[PDB]
Amino acid sequence: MELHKNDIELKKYNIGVAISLGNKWFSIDNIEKLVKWSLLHTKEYVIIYIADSIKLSDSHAEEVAIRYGRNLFIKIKERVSLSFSQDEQAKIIYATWSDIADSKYKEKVKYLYNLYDKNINFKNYIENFVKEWVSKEKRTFNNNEINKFGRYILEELPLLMVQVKARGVLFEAYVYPYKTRITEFVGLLQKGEIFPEIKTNILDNHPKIFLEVRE
């Protein structure tokens, strides 16, 4: 695959690999490709995490992590240790939800939850957002479910917008195989062009960089 940028082939950034569990593209082979591309283009490290899902925990991301991410990561570790040299393997960091969701990240999430409960324009935008995603799924969903799906998005939204640390490692950039409704929405947020209060409250002027990489 290849980037769809001079800072990259100058290896300026660390690169996160955001895996959407359940999205048919993220087979184990496509995941291996994305990791190989990131090891070749990263400044030093590649961070691998589970990034959405388009009760054993109070957080949906945490629940996904312990129910699925553990076994996914185990399959990824096996494949990697058979595809990559041992020194290349040194560059990789498997970041669970807890690695990312430090206390500083949680305040940003709290700000979004708060805003989801108090700003009905925001509430309705986020929910219509879920409503559109799922109106191409054959299955249907009620409004309480639609509303619960919305909070799940808000839980991942800071990661998409700001540069954060996982196990003490800043990663400025992340790879994803195509543009999505979400990536356009995040773009607008970072520019302050939609719900600008969000930019003012949770973006510290170092925006997460989205790199589109596909075959």
UniProtKB/TrEMBL annotation:
Q: What is this protein called?
A: Uncharacterized protein
